[PDB]
Design a binder for these strands. Structure first.
Lengths: 228, 170, 37, 127, 683
RNA sequence: GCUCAUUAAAUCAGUUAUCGUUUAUUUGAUAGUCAUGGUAUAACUGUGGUAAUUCUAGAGCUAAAAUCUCGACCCUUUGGAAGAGAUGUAUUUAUUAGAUCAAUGUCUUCGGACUCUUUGAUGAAUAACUUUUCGAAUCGCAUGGCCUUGUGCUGGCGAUGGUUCAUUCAAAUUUCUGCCCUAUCAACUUUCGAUGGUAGGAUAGUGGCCUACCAUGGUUUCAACGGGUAACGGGGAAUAAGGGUUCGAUUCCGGAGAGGGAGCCUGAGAAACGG
């Protein structure tokens, strides 16, 4: 049980292992520890199961009845308590953070693309980090770009190119999510493409290419990152 | 009981056979499934749960192409005459990949008359294959590996493919 | 059976009119947007 | 000449010689793309693909046919001795018949679906 | 045996085995293996396989030919709903090709016995048995599909008896036309089935013409076959076949290709030619459909008929050639080659030899000269040159039309690159000067082109070119003879492309100076400006040609020419505004002492003269540093738009050319030095 | 799950690629071209044998087709309307591909000719076969369009069945690094190929993994190879110990095997202690 769960050492010997799903297991998160262990919202796994069966909670527009559904970066979680809507976000201090989002920013989800390939019958497609496959994509997007998903369909509402100058959040590596999220990009021996990030406290530090997460622009980014 | 495992070998220095494991299910070096000519026989082999390899034990015809117009029909086999990597493989008459095997390509001639309408001197092709439509023993290679495909495929040799291979025949 | 042959032949053309019209529906979304480029 | 064995060779290519772009900022020499050697194991005009890890180093041995030995080295910092000490580990890589490579001859190498049990990298650029 | 039921096939095989025949008793294993569906492909590969193992005897297969054919047709008559049934149909089609020729005739007659064609053959063209049954349609479709399968396997071997194969196919074709004639809007399935029957029948008829060619004597029933073609298809044939090369169009194209079937088109009263020409003259026709018409007319031109109404076909082609003049501009590379070859074939025949025909051909040659031959091949350019020479061989000559043709020919002679094509173009101009009345400057330019062509033929005519250059220097060729000087400008540009010691370059500069002196003598605002604009068009492109070229002799000749031209002509208001001007150490000292340090507006004169020398100094060390200082003086002497163009030329060359990036940036910084000084002066 | 086992880069820790592979399970996309004529297996009695097994034999009876540069075009785009348009994947081999314009320009005779970093947009599919698929198998609800008034051609949701990709836990090799005394061991590997080339076999797959025929090479004084380690010792493996000096405690850990060699077997799992 690592520390990005943000769970106390008490109340549990065997941590709930996440099941198979649309994310890598290391930043995965079952909904049971999301409700009864971080939202402090249920008390036992048996009513966590009762939460899923009575369908008052849903993730990414689908009801998704599973105790151990892995949760990735800034998933949309829909609950029916005063019509509230939730989104995850990453913290600098090595933990998770979920916060209230209203429904207009809950309608979209800005996600990094994994790979692009021409598919069957000559059509192209693109895949994302969360396993969502979008076909007939933008031909001008490249590797390590991002896309908005509709949450009603799987298509595109918005997209920006990877560049040097705009807010590209960091996820994975020795660092995990510093706010400020940009300097520039350059190459390196062995691969490990150098991405530098400058915070609001003005310190520059290098990362890798797979940690690219273009979250928006200076001034207004597309995500509703809260106040510390 | 054959081994395909990597730790059996010596190191780049030549380390002295560290003897870590014995054989497991995962490195199952299968038997060499050498075939022959004759009436067609198929073995289905289940590996990795749901992969069904097709062992061709005996085979009598194949889908061999002719590249100058791009067509392929079904031709009855006759016998192998040369293989590059082996010589007793030819005497065994076992058809592996890239083996140069004779056929009697009568429907190739029948297609030729049905597309052109002219006899073969008894738009054009070079003269060194006119030496053996009269013989009726045309040479063809093998393209696909028959041991896992369960199929025999090849192409007819084309231009310099003769002129290098009858040089290697003699 | 005869009632089940009603629903079988109804549904076999129902997903035909649903999916293959939707197959041309986002195909024309590609065609309009390729003209944009 | 090129034909020196008992079988003719030609890559199926999934122009009579299909150019393949490497990516990672690379381009063929004109000798490679208008050559006559076939060499399907060569990273250009072949089924093998160049991707992933890259490294640069100095050729130390070129004595035999179609593979060469590259000395790459670093003044390795031993922390307890507080000393940068040079250590070389000569790795053997494949050489394509597009670059007349002698000893010295700083080059760049990268992984090419590693060929025979120690050949893990392959030349892509000379200098 | 003809039933599609397998149990009926097994019952008939028991009936065949019950018949007293010892060879069939010997072939009883062959009958059982053919009856077995699991051994269907094996029985063809062993029992039915000839020239191999387990083949039948000569007398045995002859006796058992109808029993083998009825079993094979019964396998073919099974519906191919399943994939194995579809593969069985393909195997039945393939196995039929290796049996025999007369057995193929018996199997085709067996399929014809399944259908009915005696009533249609008895009637002239009427469907007397007026039965629109879909079963009658499906039986006709099955025989059409079997014939299409037979034509697919034996595309140069499928024989066709007239009463057996050709009569039932025509009866099936006539039934489809009668079904379409009786096609009401109610029977939608019957109308759709007959449409597929008409589509399959037309493809089978086109394949039959493709299979026979010169083999089958189809002229006996060609009158009734064309009567079926004229009634069902030729009602709106030109108004229908316009998307691509149609089945009836390819049937007409193959009839155009075959000389015997060309007489069958001639047997029709020019209806096929009138339909083909009107389809060629369609408003919204396609290029691929029109291209087949062009190849068909070329085959008709290359193979004239030695029979009746051949000149009528030639007159229909010539009327189509009149429509072909407005064509050949709405169309790939092969379409341009076909349209050029058809026009060359029409000029080789010379059927359009009238004065109004030559007037339309002059308009066609005007569009041909409008189309630049840069994309086309040199043979097509030579064919266009030979076609215009054929028009020049015709005595139709004018004055205003010849002057417009000479202007295009002078543009063609300046842009000529092939040695043989320029030799033909000079001979065409020699023919044009002889043909066009009152063309003495054309005859003089023909003498100039003859010396230019003889100089290409041998080096001894170079002294003859120098004597002709001395004769033109003594000329005497004023702005009236500027049309002759336009051929001289093309000849000088041809010499500028070559390297003949710049003797023609210096002589043309002397000829331009004599022409400028005559233009200065003639104070009329029309003719002197026309000579000046002809001089401005011929020198400014040559200045840019000399800018890109490394010929310093061409640049020095242009420098001496521009020194005299600015001194003498000085006509343009833009030239008057830019008139602020008049080894390496001397070049550096002259650049610092030039008008770039004395002016701040003359952008065009500095850029057209000194920027090519700056780029030459950029390629050639101390001169490049001196040119950077000279560029900074030129940047202070330039305009706002010209400085942006030089900077955009500098920035793009910095990214593209990796030759001297730092020197280009140093030149950009020197350009930014006068820009920052002017920006602070404005601020 | 149990007992006996240390080989010192060996497990292991991971810096990584797997466009070189596999994947039941997790998600996200994903097709089309006679209301059983037909075999159902299914048990049952009814006698037996054998010292004897969940031992056993034998007898009877279970209008299936839409699409089009789209068009001859007309008379309007609510449009419809001649018809050379033809339109399933699976395996399994071949043959054919996968630029310039409207320019924010110099220049023009004030039209517009010289039209990529001169506005701006960026080129560089199939002909055959195979021991295909029969191309929604089911289902709960609704009880509709209108006469084809028939137990009708009907769909609104059909939750769920399948096809092929990506993702996911599952490993397979492999990139480098992370260890202990040593040169009173200087050469070792071919002394099971040792190193590469190509071909073939095998593999899920790269592969000298194996085989064939070649070329003779590869790793080293920066230490190759070789002697020491209860390696019950190392590993941040893990919170801590709110002062027990540096840890009282947490765990990974080194393997083989089910009486013993030998071979086989099914499962997305495996050379099984569930044969």
């Amino acid at each position: 049980a690592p520390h990005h769960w943000l769970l106390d050492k008490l109340s549990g010997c065997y941590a709930p292992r996440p099941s198979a799903g649309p994310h890598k297991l290391r930043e995965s998160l079952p909904l049971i520890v999301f409700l009864r262990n971080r939202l402090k919202y249920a008390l036992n796994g048996r009513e966590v199961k009762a939460i899923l069966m009575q369908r008052h909670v849903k993730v990414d527009g689908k009801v998704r009845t599973d105790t151990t559904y892995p949760a990735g970066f800034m998933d949309v979680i829909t609950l029916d308590a005063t019509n509230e809507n939730f989104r995850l976000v990453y913290d600098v201090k090595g933990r998770f953070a979920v916060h209230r989002i209203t429904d207009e920013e809950a309608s979209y989800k800005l996600g990094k693309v994994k790979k692009v390939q021409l598919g069957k019958k000559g059509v192209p497609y693109v895949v994302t980090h969360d396993g969502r496959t979008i076909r007939y994509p933008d031909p001008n997007i490249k590797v390590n770009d991002t896309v908005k998903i509709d949450l009603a369909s799987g298509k595109i509402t918005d997209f920006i190119k990877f560049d040097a100058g705009k807010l590209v959040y960091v996820t994975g590596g020795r660092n995990l999510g510093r706010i400020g999220t940009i300097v520039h990009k350059e190459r390196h021996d062995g691969g490990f493409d150098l991405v530098h990030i400058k915070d609001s406290l003005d310190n520059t530090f290098v990362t890798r290419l797979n940690n690219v997460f273009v979250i928006g622009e200076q001034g207004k980014p597309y995500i509703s990152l809260p106040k510390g | 009981g054959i081994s395909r495992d990597s730790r059996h070998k010596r190191s780049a220095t030549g380390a002295k056979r560290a003897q870590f494991r014995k054989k497991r299910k995962f490195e199952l070096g299968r038997q060499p499934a050498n075939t022959k000519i004759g009436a067609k026989r198929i073995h289905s082999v289940r590996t990795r749960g749901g992969n069904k390899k097709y062992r061709a034990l005996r085979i009598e015809t194949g889908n061999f192409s002719w590249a100058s117009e791009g067509i392929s029909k079904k031709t009855r086999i006759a016998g192998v005459v040369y293989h590059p990597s082996n010589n007793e493989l030819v005497r065994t008459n076992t058809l592996t990949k890239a083996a140069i095997v004779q056929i009697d390509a009568t429907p190739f001639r029948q297609w030729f008359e049905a597309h052109y309408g002219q006899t073969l001197g008894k738009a054009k092709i070079e003269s060194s294959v006119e030496s053996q439509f009269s013989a009726g023993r045309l040479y063809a290679c093998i393209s696909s590996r028959p041991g896992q495909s369960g199929r025999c495929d090849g192409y007819i040799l084309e231009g310099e493919e003769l002129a290098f291979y009858l040089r290697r025949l003699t | 059976r005869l009632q089940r042959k009603r629903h079988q032949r109804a549904l076999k053309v129902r997903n035909a009119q649903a999916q293959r019209e939707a197959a041309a529906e986002y195909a024309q979304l590609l065609a309009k947007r390729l003209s944009e480029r | 000449t090129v034909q020196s064995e008992r079988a003719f060779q030609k890559q199926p290519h999934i122009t009579k010689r299909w150019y393949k772009n490497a990516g990672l900022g690379f381009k063929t020499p004109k000798t490679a793309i208008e050559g006559s050697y076939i060499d399907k194991k060569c990273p250009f005009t072949g089924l093998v693909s160049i991707r992933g890890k890259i490294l640069t180093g100095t050729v130390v041995s070129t004595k035999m046919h179609r593979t060469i030995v590259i000395r790459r080295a670093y003044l390795h910092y031993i922390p307890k001795y507080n000393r940068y000490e040079k250590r070389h580990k000569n790795v053997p890589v494949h050489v394509s018949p597009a670059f007349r490579v002698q000893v010295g001859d700083i080059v760049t190498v990268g992984q090419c679906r590693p060929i025979s049990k120690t050949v893990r990298f392959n030349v892509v650029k000379v200098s | 045996l003809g039933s599609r039921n397998t149990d009926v096939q097994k019952l008939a095989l028991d009936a065949l085995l019950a018949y007293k025949n010892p060879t069939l008793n010997k072939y009883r294993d062959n009958l059982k293996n053919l009856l077995d569906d699991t051994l269907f492909k094996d029985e063809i590969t062993t029992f039915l396989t000839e020239n191999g193992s387990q083949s039948i005897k000569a007398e045995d297969e002859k006796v058992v030919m109808p029993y083998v054919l009825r079993i094979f047709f019964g396998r073919a008559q099974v519906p191919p709903t399943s994939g194995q049934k579809r593969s069985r149909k393909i195997a039945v089609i393939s196995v039929l090709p290796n049996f025999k020729k007369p057995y193929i005739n018996d199997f085709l007659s067996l399929a014809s016995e399944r259908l009915d064609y005696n009533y249609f053959f008895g009637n002239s063209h009427q469907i007397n048995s007026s039965k629109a049954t879909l079963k009658t349609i499906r039986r006709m479709t099955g025989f059409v599909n079997i014939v299409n399968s037979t034509l697919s396997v034996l595309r140069t071997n499928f024989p066709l008896h007239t009463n057996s194969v050709l009569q039932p196919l025509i009866y099936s074709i006539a039934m489809a036309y009668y079904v379409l004639d009786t096609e009401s809007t109610e029977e939608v399935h019957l109308r759709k089935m007959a449409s597929n029957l008409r589509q399959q029948g037309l493809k089978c008829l086109s394949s039959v013409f493709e299979f026979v060619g010169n083999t089958f004597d189809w002229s006996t029933s060609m009158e009734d076959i064309y009567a079926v073609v004229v009634k069902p298809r030729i009602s709106h044939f030109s108004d229908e076949n316009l998307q691509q090369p149609s089945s009836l169009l390819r049937l007409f194209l193959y009839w155009a290709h075959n000389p015997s079937l060309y007489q069958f088109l001639y047997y029709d009263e020019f209806a096929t030619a009138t339909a083909l020409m009107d389809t060629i003259s369609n408003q919204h026709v396609k290029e691929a459909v029109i291209g087949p018409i062009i190849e068909a007319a070329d085959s008709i031109i290359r193979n004239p008929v030695n029979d009746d109404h051949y000149v009528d076909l030639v007159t229909l082609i010539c009327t189509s050639c009149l429509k072909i003049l407005p064509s050949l501009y709405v169309k790939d590379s092969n379409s341009i080659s076909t349209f050029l070859n058809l026009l060359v074939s029409i000029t080789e025949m010379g059927f359009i030899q009238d004065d109004h025909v030559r007037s339309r051909l002059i308009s066609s040659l005007i569009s041909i000269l409008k189309g630049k031959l840069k994309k086309l091949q040199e043979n097509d350019t030579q064919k266009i040159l030979k076609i215009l020479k054929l028009i020049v061989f015709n005595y139709n000559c004018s004055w205003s039309d010849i002057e417009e043709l000479y202007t295009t020919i002078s543009s063609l002679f300046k842009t000529f690159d092939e040695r043989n094509l320029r030799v033909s173009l000079t001979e065409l101009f020699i023919e044009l000067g002889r043909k066009v009345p009152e063309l003495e400057s054309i005859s003089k330019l023909v003498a100039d082109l003859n010396s230019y062509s003889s100089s290409r033929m041998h080096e001894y005519d170079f002294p003859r070119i120098l004597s002709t250059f001395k004769g033109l220097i003594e000329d005497g060729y004023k702005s009236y003879s500027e049309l002759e000087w336009l051929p001289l400008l093309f000849t000088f540009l041809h010499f500028i492309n070559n390297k003949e010691e710049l003797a023609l370059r210096t002589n043309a500069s002397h000829a331009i100076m004599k022409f400028i002196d005559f233009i200065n003598e003639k104070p009329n605002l029309n003719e002197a400006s026309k000579s000046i604009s002809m001089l401005k068009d011929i020198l400014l492109p040559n200045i840019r040609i000399g800018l890109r070229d490394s010929l310093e002799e061409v640049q020095s000749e242009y420098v001496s020419v521009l020194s005299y031209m600015v001194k003498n002509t000085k006509y343009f208001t833009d030239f008057e505004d830019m008139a602020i001007l008049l080894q390496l150490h001397r070049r550096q000292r002259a650049i610092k002492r030039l008008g770039e340090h004395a002016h701040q507006l003359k952008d065009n004169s500095i850029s057209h003269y000194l920027i090519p020398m700056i780029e030459h100094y950029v390629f050639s060390r101390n001169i490049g540093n001196e040119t950077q200082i000279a560029i900074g003086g030129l940047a202070q002497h330039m305009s706002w738009n010209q400085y942006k163009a030089l900077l955009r030329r500098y920035i793009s060359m910095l990214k593209t050319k990796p030759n001297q990036m730092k020197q280009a940036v140093q030149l950009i910084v020197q350009l930014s030095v006068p820009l920052r000084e002017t920006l602070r002066i404005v601020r």
